[PDB]
């Protein structure tokens, strides 16, 4: 509703264009940047392939808008993981491929597993006097 008769471009504080009104149709659009980002690749010297993490992307978005691949995939907490088996039920006390938030990539194929470096010592003695 903000475009007056002499106005056709919406700018931010930095001087990027972020919206416009089309001179022919008078339709109004917001402009958003196309997605840009890195791939976090985990590699082990004893392996022939990478485990790939697309941080904060759901696998449907990666496959539909970035690239199709033949590799198996799943939606982990950190984002879409390719070429690793979802085994967060399993746990490891040491990890060379630390992904964040207590998740680790382990290699035998790759596994995506939880990192739990410390334990409590347990005894079966009574708590009560």
């Amino acid at each position: 509703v903000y475009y007056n008769s002499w106005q056709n471009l919406l700018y931010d504080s930095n001087g990027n264009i972020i919206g416009f009104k089309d001179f022919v149709t008078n339709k109004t659009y917001n402009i958003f940047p196309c997605y840009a980002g890195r791939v976090s690749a985990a590699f082990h010297q004893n392996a022939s392939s990478l485990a790939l993490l697309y941080r904060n992307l759901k696998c449907s978005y990666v496959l539909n808008n970035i690239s199709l691949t033949t590799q198996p995939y799943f939606d982990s907490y950190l984002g879409c993981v390719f070429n690793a088996d979802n085994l967060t039920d399993y746990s490891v006390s040491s990890c060379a491929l630390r992904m964040g938030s207590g998740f680790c990539v382990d290699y035998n194929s790759y596994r995506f597993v939880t990192f739990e470096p410390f334990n409590v010592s347990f005894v079966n003695d009574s708590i009560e006097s």
Binding site: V1, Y2, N4, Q7
Partner: protein, 48 residues
Amino acid sequence: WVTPLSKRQYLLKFDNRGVITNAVDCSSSFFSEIQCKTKSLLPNTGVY
């Protein structure tokens, strides 16, 4: 009422409908300089 124009730097504030509600002539006074430095009409409490 008439006053001279010249090439000057202003802070301009636009509201949520794109009207200029306020302005600051940055070199006109010490408080105007604090407003332009902080890009705000009411700077935070502090020593500048």
